Structures are given as structure tokens and as C-alpha cells.
From Swiss-Prot, chains A, B, C:
GO terms for biological process: symbiont genome ejection through host cell envelope, short tail mechanism. The chain holds residues 38 to 139 of 196 of the full protein. Component of the cylindrical core that assembles on the inner surface of the capsid during capsid formation and plays a role in viral DNA ejection into the host cell. The inner core is composed of stacked rings of gp14, gp15 and gp16 proteins. Following binding to the host cell surface, the internal core is disassembled and gp14 is ejected along with gp15 and gp16 into the infected cell. May form a simple channel spanning the outer membrane. It is found in: Virion; Host cell outer membrane. The keyword Membrane applies. Interacts with the portal protein. Interacts with gp15. Belongs to the T7virus internal virion protein gp14 family. This is Internal virion protein gp14. Keywords: Host cell outer membrane, Host membrane, Membrane, Viral genome ejection through host cell envelope, Viral penetration into host cytoplasm, Viral short tail ejection system, Virion, Virus entry into host cell. GO terms for cellular component: host cell plasma membrane; membrane; virion component.
UniProtKB/Swiss-Prot annotation, chain E:
This is Tail tubular protein gp12. Interacts with head-to-tail connector protein gp8, the tail component gp11, and the fiber protein gp17. It comes from Escherichia phage T7. The chain holds residues 398 to 447 of 794 of the full protein. It is found in: Virion. It comes from the Viruses. Structural component of the short non-contractile tail. The tail complex is involved in viral genome delivery. Forms the end of the tail, including the canonical tube, the nozzle, and the small extensions below the fibers. Once the tail tubular structure is formed, the interface between gp11 and gp12 generates the proper environment to interact with the six gp17 trimers.
Amino acid sequence: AMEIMRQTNIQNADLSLQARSKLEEASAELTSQNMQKVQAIGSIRAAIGESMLEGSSMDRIKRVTEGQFIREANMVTENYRRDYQAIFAQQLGGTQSAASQI
Amino acid sequence: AMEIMRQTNIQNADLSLQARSKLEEASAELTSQNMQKVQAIGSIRAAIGESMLEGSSMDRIKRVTEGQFIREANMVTENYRRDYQAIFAQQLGGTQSAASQI
Amino acid sequence: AMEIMRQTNIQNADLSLQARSKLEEASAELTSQNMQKVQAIGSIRAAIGESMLEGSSMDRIKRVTEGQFIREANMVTENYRRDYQAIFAQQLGGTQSAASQI
Amino acid sequence: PNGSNYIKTANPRNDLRMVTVADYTFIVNRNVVAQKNTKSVNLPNYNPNQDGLINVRGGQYGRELIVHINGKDVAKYKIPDGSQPEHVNNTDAQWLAEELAKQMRTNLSDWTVNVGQGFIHVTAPSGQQIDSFTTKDGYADQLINPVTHYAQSFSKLPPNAPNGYMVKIVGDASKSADQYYVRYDAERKVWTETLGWNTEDQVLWETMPHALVRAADGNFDFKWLEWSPKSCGDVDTNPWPSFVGSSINDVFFFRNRLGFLSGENIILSRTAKYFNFYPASIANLSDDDPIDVAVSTNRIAILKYAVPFSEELLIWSDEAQFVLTASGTLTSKSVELNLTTQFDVQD
Amino acid sequence: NRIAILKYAVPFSEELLIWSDEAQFVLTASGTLTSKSVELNLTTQFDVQD
């Protein structure tokens, strides 16, 4: 039973390490989408500053593309949170089966 | 037999959680196709409003593309319903085999 | 032996359900190729009607593209029939091995 | 119908400028300014606080449920971790909700509690709001998602909801780019964007341009056109038309869209529907959006008149003349204004 | 912008011309004439009679 608890806890720590790697690669994905967002919104300013349109509807389009990037960021972080739910629940269920056999 | 009932029921609850995930990601797919549909039908209204065609045949082409997107939505929800049939029948068969061994 | 025959028959009914899903998704593939075919042959009529060439050779080219799509349909239905042969023969071999063990 | 007050002026000629497009000839008074109608707000003071939807999701068997109500725990039930095939009912959606909701009723009746196939709804307590709504049931909250009225994305919005509701999806507070309001309508399972909390949807109407139309009976009716309600969330995100302070100086049907030349703004109504002036939809650009543009140039310029022409409207202003030209679908994206002449004009 | 009865039409070749009482419009489509490409233009304004 000591070997069993040690093995299940090592698997749990492995899963937590997986969660760490997942969060940091999600951070690398978020920052890459950011690195795309900066260029995009820079292009958009450039456009607006050059045509003399100067309008609320013109600002509206800037806000539209900004909301697009924000939505993608939200999709990315929701993906991360779902993966976290998956791995947590998985380690939980494993610990439960091991506890029942114990 | 108690351990067996509990294990099969935990697997069934896992499958139900899976069904919940399937439905919400299907909702995220439907809403994304919607987010495409809005831009498409906006472009179509722009076209029709600008050419002075003023025709039922134009109205027909708008209805054609609208039906395109509606068929697409029906396709994705049919995919979801087939996946639901699959997972339900799978958990049912598993419970049946466990009941026979019990 | 009763459990064995029940299990093999449940697997066979699962395979028949797979055959049902296969035929209906093949129907959805055929109808989609049809939905492409209608647009294609409409474009072809438009072309032929426009020029005033009035040629048997243009009738020939229309028949050529029509035969293209017909061969495509025959290809997909042949794929379906091969898959049906595969699943049938598979369930037959399984039932045979189970019968030998019985 | 609806009076004839708008037409009156001391000098009819200078002030009443009009255009004609068959069914409805639009008569627009230069003199009378528009006003937002604040006596008709859609959402008076939507109480964001009162209602929370306890999401009903999968149980996960043994993981117990603790659901704080108004920050106070009253919802405690632990799923019977019993093997029995009959015992498996312990986790289905309706039953779990019932267990939890009746329990909410026991603690206090100030808030009314309900069961829905997908949800448990707290009716607003009459004077006391949910000061804070939180819950940690199960390891990852995989059973109950508190949803509130504010959430992170298109995701995390409950699947079934009451016949009317409001959810504002916000990316972050400082940038309002992704803010829009979503309402669930029950009859068709759908979620739609309807105007959000506390913003009125209509100008006073009377003050706006009135329209002269001809009845089918051969007599003519002066009438107030039914200008469109905005139907989008928040005052800031769906900008007020912005001709409201100003007189509507001339009215013009450039392209197919209706248009008002305002004090400094070409407010052009959505291009293919004549009267839906406010932005059609908040978070997805639609080229059938109206174009509200101001010709800043380098000198604030009032826009005195406009001439429709064909492919491109010309805008004449006191100290310069500018041409707005877009061959492609006239859209907010392609306006392309040019300042190309400098002769003067007078009143 | 004005309901116009269409009095006559003249076939021509590439593009039919439509003559109406108060304006003359040309329907032109070089590509396959289709609902998609009609492209009507109002380009002249002389009058016609019955």
C-alpha cells in the first residue's frame, strides 16, 4: 500500500508538472497572439490616421478588430481551463480507484 | 460487485461530462459559423442595395446563401446528435456487460 | 456460452449500426457531390448558351464533365460497398471463431 | 397623423429642405434639432446583482457540492456515492438541481428559487442583492457554473436560460472592444444581442425628420417616420447618432443609403435599409453598417450642402469641397474621402 | 428612384438596352449573363413616347 500511494502521488506530481508546462505554453501562445495583435492594431491606426475619416464608425471598426483578438485570447484561455479540469479530474479519479483498492 | 457498480457509474459520469463538453464546443462551433454568417449576409445586403437590381431573383440569391449556412448548421448539429447516440449507446453496452458479469 | 453468443451478437448489431451510419454518411457525401454537380452543370449550360457555337462538340464537353461527376459517384459508392464487404466479413469471422470456441 | 408641428417655421423656404424617393418623400427641417428620448429607457436599472443562474452540469459522483448563496453557504449536498443501479440517479441534471434549490429555499425565502431543465434561478431578493456570488463544488467546479451576468467569453454562458436574461461578455474593463450584450430567448433556443442595461433606444421621433408619404387612397399623409431603435448594447459602444445636438442640414440618398448631412458629420444610414441609423451589430463588422464620419480635414468645417450625383457624393462645405468616393460596396471600410477643390460657397 | 414602366427594349449584342419613359438604362454583363452579374446602369435621360 505504501508503494501504491507513492506511485499514485508520483503520477499526480507528473500531472501537476504537465499543468505547469501547459500553462507556460499557453502563455507563449497568448504572447504570440499579442505579437500579432500589436502589428494588426498598428496597421489599423495607420489606416485611420491617414484618410481624414475621423469618425465614431471609424473607431467602431478598430474596436471590432480589437474585440476579435480579445475573443481569440478568451478562446485560448478557456482551452487551457478545460485542459486543467481534465487533468485534475483524471488524477482525482485515479487516486479514488487506488484508494478503493487500498 | 459494489466496486464494479461504482466504477461503471464513474465511467458513465465521465461520459456525461464528455457529452456536456461536446455540446458546449458544438455551441462554440455554431456561434463561430454564425459569426461568419453575419459578415457574409452583410456583404450580400451591401451588394443588393447598391446595384438597383431590385429583384426577386436577387432576393433568391440571398435566400440561397442563407440556406447554405442553415444547411451547414444542421450538418453540425446532426454531427453532435450522432456523437451523443454513440456515447449513450457505449455507456449502455458497458453497463450491460457489467450487469451480466454481476 | 450464452454470455458468449450474447456478446458476439451485440458486437454484430454494433457493426450493423456502423453499416447504417456508413450508408447515411455516404448518402450525405453523394448529395454533397450532387450539390456541386448542379452548380457545375449550370455554369456549363451558361457557357454553351452564351456563345452561339451550338456545337455537338460542346454537347460532347458537357457530356464529358457529366461523366466526370458520374464516375466520381460510382467511386464513392464502390468505396461504400468495399467497406460493407469488410465489416460483414469481419463479423462473420468473429462469429466463426466464437463458434469454434463454443 | 402625428401632428404637423415640424413643418411650421417663420420662413418656410430657407428651412425646409427635402428629398424624394417614390413612396416616401422625406421632409427635413433644418431648424429643429433632435433629442434622445430619456423617458423611454429599455432597461431601467437592470439589477445586475439580483439574479444568478446556477448552472446545472454533470455531477462527477462523489465530489460534494458546496454553493455559497450571497456569499453564505446554504447549498450543501453530497451526491450519494452509492453503487446501486437505482442509486445512479444521484447525478442527473434535474434531480441535482432540485436537491440544491429546495435547500436554498430553506435558508431564506427572500430569494425565490426555481428549477429549469438546465438551471436553477434565484429571483431577486426584494431589497437585498447578491452581495457576492461564488461556488467551489467539486475539484474544478465541473458541476455548477455560476454564470452571473458578466462572463469571459462566448463560452461560459449557460446552455438553457430563462425567457429573458442579460449577459455582458467583456474582455477587460479598460478596452471596450469586445463588449456586447446577449439575451436568451426561450421559444427558439437562441441567444441574441439586444440593447443592454440602461440605454434608451430611440430619439424623440418628433424632432427627427418627418416624412411626407402618399396613402393608397389618393390623399396624402404627413407622418413621423418610424426611425429605428438602436438595438445594440451600451451607449458608448453603439454611439448615439451624434447629429442629435445638430440640425439636420440637408437630407440625401447617396448610393442606396439614406443620409443626413449634419453639423460636421455625414451621417449616412445603413446602406441598404433606409431607416436603421445606429450601428447594426456591436462585435462583428457588417458592411451594411451605417457610416458616421466627420470631415475633420485641418480646419473644423461645417458641412453646408450635399449633392448626390451617382457613383460619388460630393460634399460642399464653406471653405473647401470634398468628394466621398467608393466604387466598391460603399462601406465604412472603403469611404476614401478626398479634398480636391478650394472655392468658396455661401448660405 | 422613380417607378418606371419599361416601354421598349432593343436587343443589340453584348448588352440589351432598356428604354423607359423617363430614363434609359443599359443592362450589361460580359461574363455569363447570370443573376449574379447583371450590373444595370442608368446613363442617359432623354424622353420617349408611345
